[PDB]
Amino acid sequence: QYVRIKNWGSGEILHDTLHHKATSDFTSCLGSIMNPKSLTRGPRDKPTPLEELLPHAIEFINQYYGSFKEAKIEEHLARLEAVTKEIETTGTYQLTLDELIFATKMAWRNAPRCIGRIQWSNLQVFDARNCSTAQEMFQHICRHILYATNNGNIRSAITVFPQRSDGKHDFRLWNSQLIRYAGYQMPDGTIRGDAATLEFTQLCIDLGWKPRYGRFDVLPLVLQADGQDPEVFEIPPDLVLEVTMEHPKYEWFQELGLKWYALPAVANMLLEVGGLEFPACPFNGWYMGTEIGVRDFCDTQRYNILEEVGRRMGLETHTLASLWKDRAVTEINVAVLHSFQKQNVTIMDHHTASESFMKHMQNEYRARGGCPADWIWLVPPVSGSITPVFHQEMLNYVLSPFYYYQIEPWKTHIW
Amino acid sequence: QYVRIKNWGSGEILHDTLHHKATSDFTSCLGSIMNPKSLTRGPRDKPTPLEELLPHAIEFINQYYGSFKEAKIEEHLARLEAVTKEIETTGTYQLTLDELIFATKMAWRNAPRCIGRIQWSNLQVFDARNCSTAQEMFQHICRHILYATNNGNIRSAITVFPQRSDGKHDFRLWNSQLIRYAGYQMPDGTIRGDAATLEFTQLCIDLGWKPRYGRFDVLPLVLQADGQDPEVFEIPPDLVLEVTMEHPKYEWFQELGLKWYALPAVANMLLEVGGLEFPACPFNGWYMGTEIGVRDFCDTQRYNILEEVGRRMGLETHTLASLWKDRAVTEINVAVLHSFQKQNVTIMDHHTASESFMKHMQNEYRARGGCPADWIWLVPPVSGSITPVFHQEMLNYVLSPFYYYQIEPWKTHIW
């Protein structure tokens, strides 16, 4: 009938009906869409039909065993055999720790929106499939954060919780990411903290979390284990490393009293592998300057600090043509970069980042003749063409294993 | 068997075979591809089958007449009738001047890669469908350039040459754009001028054009009329307005001896409307700073001036993390912006540009429930997220009329 389009800036929505008047095939392209269904893996009410499971499972095992040099046909056959048997006897099956590690890295490799994939091989895997309570999740999460942070020397890691069984017993981290500041609608009408986390913050407030009404209050873990309602847990402050923002030239920069957490970790995605689904598998890598300097600090819908960094630089903040914005954003980026380096916290600029990916992409094409890539995500939010990936044509397809998005729990959860 | 992917930076090519291992529908997305077939309209050996023409023609006329308020049912019916008759009697048909104007603006509106579409309504249309020789094209082109340039006060315009008849009598501007500097491979191994125009420059050399071996030699018009071979014509210098590059603060900027032409006009695209095809319809709008400042000046494959603008600013050009590139590019952009403004030549920054489009997009969605948009093209090559369109989800589909790309003539032309 019509497609919905969202403007993540003003939040407005539009209904497109004109596309119906389109022509032949043409490579209605939904490329610019943030969360399309093709990238979401939703709820389930029953186990996965065996007819679908067994095939996918067999495929995964052949991939796994066909993965290493000096094949192990016996182990391979035995495993195929072993897995089939386990499926007809249990209705599902369990991956060996090695297959799990393999799945997590391949899924990573298969993440078309990640520019850090040259690191795919270096990944720590915390096996928590035996987890059973929310309290145990909290412990596992805390361990993860502590491990990954490594006192500023960031290390990539992921922890796998119990795989979805019937769909009515899913483990789910309700947060979008492990660490993330909250946003409050002040009584004077203004907004403090992360404007983008207003709702979720309310959700935590509603679940008993006590608001501290600050600009950088680290939100709480909202965990749901097995299938029960979500329980709230504050993250032990000693575990949230942060970087205070300061400019290498403008002393008035820290006067802005800005800072950001050092750990970038996605918390609400689903890991799909060999037919199995893991609705809870938080993972982390490390930051790319522009994420904080450009998106977090300069997005209108976020901290929105461009205007004042502008005036502080004594720019013509009232004349767009002056290009003051391009001037300020760069200085902010320099602040972030400088601060992370000074405080010995791993981070990387977008230029170094792009060249890195290009190398990955070529290695990838030589090793397996391809590399799924979402150009719209791989091109940094500043200096796009100054980057190699901007000039690189890319193909974006969904392989498997894969890290999918999933419907926000608070929407499809019965208390 | 496999898809080809190109890196417009290094020019390297990769063969993707992995995509075959993809899964369900998912909104192999070819979004990052520069020239997909879905966006190209190629050669033809025979007229358009009447069975296809008549329907498209009728659609176009119903669009045209259903376009204005206070309908003209009589004129509409008469026209439908008149057009049908003309098709069975001639095998084709001729658009009235108004329909042509309508088609050109709608096609413009339907250009998903254009951020200047808020201007769609203001377009000058030079009717040259009666053109018959290359010399006459040259005259028409010259007029166009002169009109559009308007002494720096740029005006958008397009000139329509004879519509494709049998496919073996096409008018074609071999150049990609009206004005464009040439690139030569010097004997010392270096490259002077526009590195990206090396081949085409050779093509002009091969057709008798005399190289001037400069950094900014305006390439010649390589015109082919009716169906005959292409004839070469140098553009009268008095018609090519240029802007000398100078920085509002660094006096050493002009020491770089840089400049750029003021007229941005695409020359090799095809206009598809009501079943009719126009393989030659050069059009122009005006520049957006980043085009010159970022793409032309900073692309590796183009003038590649980043490195030296960097040293000239006394930056750490050997430490990517220093973000010197983000610093230089902004200054270059300021140079371009400043220079065009100083010399009274129409131009616009990317920030003003984005807000403009956003307005267009909302107007468009209200007026017709949609607006085809290629996010990958609409987001500027610098300060992406600092722009509103970066946060705007977009749908990219091909409507009609439409401006298509076409195969490079020198590839499918028999002399």
Ligand code: HEM
């Ligand atoms: C070694 C360091 C790593 C770096 C520097 C890195 C960097 C990035 C960046 C810059 C983004 C863009 C985020 C955004 O625009 O919101 C991203 C996205 C992504 N990365 Fe990586 N990453 C790393 C490791 C990983 C790991 C270990 C995984 C998984 C095991 C992974 C999975 C993904 C996924 C799924 C996305 C998409 C997130 C989304 O769609 O919201 N990355 N990464």
Ligand code: HEM
């Ligand atoms: C009034 C001023 C206009 C401005 C400021 C404008 C600006 C732009 C810019 C910045 C691009 C990107 C070019 C690139 O990245 O190479 C573009 C693309 C495009 N514009 Fe507009 N434009 C204008 C008028 C027009 C007109 C009058 C037409 C047609 C009648 C048009 C048709 C297109 C098309 C087809 C593209 C795609 C070109 C390609 O795919 O290579 N534009 N325009």
Ligand SMILES: NC1=N[C@H](CCNC(=O)c2ccoc2)Nc2c(F)ccc(F)c21
């Ligand atoms: N470097 C990474 N950035 C984002 C996750 C962190 N994003 C946030 O914390 C956030 C999103 C909006 O506002 C804040 N994506 C990542 C991922 F999916 C995996 C590993 C990473 F290293 C990152």
Ligand SMILES: NC1=N[C@H](CCNC(=O)c2ccoc2)Nc2c(F)ccc(F)c21
């Ligand atoms: N402003 C515009 N830029 C480009 C055409 C000009 N591009 C070039 O001249 C060029 C491309 C590569 O190197 C130079 N696209 C445009 C278009 F298709 C129509 C009107 C325009 F205003 C532009």
Ligand SMILES: C[C@H](O)[C@H](O)[C@@H]1CNc2nc(N)[nH]c(=O)c2N1
């Ligand atoms: C590979 C990629 O599509 C290409 O390098 C880009 C992306 N988007 C673009 N955006 C615009 N406006 N113009 C361009 O030339 C390109 N090229």
Ligand SMILES: C[C@H](O)[C@H](O)[C@@H]1CNc2nc(N)[nH]c(=O)c2N1
């Ligand atoms: C609408 C558009 O898709 C959205 O605003 C963008 C584009 N690409 C992106 N690129 C990255 N890496 N991260 C993002 O959040 C986005 N969001």
